[PDB]
Amino acid sequence: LAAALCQAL
Ligand SMILES: [Pb+2]
């Protein structure tokens, strides 16, 4: 979940 968000941003 944390990774997904870092990538998105
Ligand atoms: Pb991250």
XYZ file of N, CA, C and O and ligand atoms in Angstrom:
37
model
N 0.804 -1.206 0.000
C 0.000 0.000 0.000
C 0.847 1.270 0.000
O 0.592 2.201 -0.768
N 1.851 1.295 0.866
C 2.740 2.422 1.009
C 3.510 2.667 -0.309
O 3.614 3.768 -0.858
N 4.030 1.567 -0.855
C 4.732 1.610 -2.134
C 3.863 2.156 -3.274
O 4.319 2.994 -4.082
N 2.621 1.691 -3.352
C 1.708 2.127 -4.390
C 1.595 3.656 -4.439
O 1.627 4.319 -5.467
N 1.470 4.218 -3.244
C 1.274 5.647 -3.086
C 2.537 6.425 -3.426
O 2.474 7.448 -4.116
N 3.688 5.945 -2.965
C 4.931 6.589 -3.349
C 5.091 6.609 -4.865
O 5.494 7.623 -5.442
N 4.766 5.513 -5.532
C 4.892 5.450 -6.976
C 3.910 6.421 -7.636
O 4.293 7.203 -8.511
N 2.643 6.355 -7.248
C 1.642 7.238 -7.794
C 2.061 8.717 -7.795
O 1.829 9.487 -8.729
N 2.706 9.112 -6.701
C 3.083 10.511 -6.496
C 4.483 10.846 -6.994
O 5.012 11.926 -6.754
Pb 7.541 4.054 0.024
